[PDB]
Paper text:
Our work focuses on the biopolymer poly-β(1,6)-N-acetyl-D-glucosamine (PNAG), which is produced by numerous pathogenic organisms. The final protein is PgaB, a two-domain periplasmic protein with an N-terminal family four carbohydrate esterase (CE4) domain that displays metal-dependent deacetylation activity on PNAG oligomers.
Bb-GH crystallized in the monoclinic space-group P21. Diffraction data were collected to 1.76 Å resolution and the structure was determined by molecular replacement. We do not believe this assembly is biologically relevant as size exclusion chromatography shows that Bb-GH elutes as a monomer in solution. Bb-GH adopts a (β/α)8 barrel fold observed in GH13 family members, and also common to a wide range of other glycoside hydrolases families. There is also a defined pocket at the center of the groove. This central pocket and most of the electrostatic groove contain residues that are highly conserved among orthologues. Taken together, the mutagenesis data suggests that residues D326, D328, D364, and E585 play a role in substrate binding as the asparagine or glutamine mutants displayed detectable activity, while D474 is the most probable residue to be involved in catalysis as it is the only residue whose activity is ablated in both the asparagine and alanine variants. Considering that neither PgaBBb nor PgaBEc have sequence or structural similarity to the active site to DspB or other closely related GH family members, we propose that the C-terminal domain of PgaB defines a new GH family, GH153.
Residue numbers in the entry: 318 to 670
The structure:
Amino acid sequence: PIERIVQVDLDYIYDPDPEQQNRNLGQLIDRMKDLAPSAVYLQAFADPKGDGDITEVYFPNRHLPMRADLFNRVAWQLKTRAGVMVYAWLPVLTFSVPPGNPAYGKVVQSTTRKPGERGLGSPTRLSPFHPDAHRVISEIYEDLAKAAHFDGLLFHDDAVLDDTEDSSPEALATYQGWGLPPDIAAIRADPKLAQQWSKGKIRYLIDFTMHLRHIVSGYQNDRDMVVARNLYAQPVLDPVSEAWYGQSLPEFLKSYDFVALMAMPNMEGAARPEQWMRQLVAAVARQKGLDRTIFELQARDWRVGKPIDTEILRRQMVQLRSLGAINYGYYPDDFIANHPDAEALRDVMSLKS
């Protein structure tokens, strides 16, 4: 079994001119037919500002405005014309519902964070410990399942909690239920409690995504609903950092069909990108995770706003192959600018590899 995946932004397809939008879609379909990946991870939410404040999505639903009714038709065209599997890529927590929504303002709190700033996680993450936020997110996933036909779910990288979160009253009450004091200062001060708390939050988020899976699978009438989740590299390279990510490679491997590991040394600011990738693969191997870890590479340098040379991307794929990491893919597909170069990547993205 081999996965070769392409993650695709509907933000790149969308255009206020529906005829331009159609031309955009056409270019995507042609590239995916040519490249023939195992799966496309398809954005179901809108994030055109790139700040992770998700006020709109691309499917009809009860809670958020629709930017365009686009996910269902792109998913169907990918499936039927390009012959690929399609995963719905959706946030776990970040839904900026309108005022008057029951979940409005029921967000993840931090003991130290102030207004007007953020850490890795978005300030807009709804608290999965709050019953109204829990239900609203559940209903958004239900509405996705009603609105479109797809083969899997990719749970987004927005599902993070740091070591000062979640400090909201509902979260504290949940920690008390785990046998911890409802007091993050007290938890953090005791290394044993701090470890238990970190692992507890990791499992809580995973369990929440399993709840969402159950909702979607019931509606897709499909027990074979495959799930993947984005995993940051730092918890893999340095597992102590689980405590301020709320993610874990061993726990992910136990719970998801695939782990979408963000193998992106450029984004990470790696001084020695080849060594970095070598160490990342070794870490995954050490956890016996190569069979279900997808090394998701970056095709764009988002910080400087430039495509990454396709030859650099291919060299990363060849390096992965040489190390026995046979599942991989890239994000994003810039189908309008023909980047990455499909001709150059075809041989390594082929499922005969």
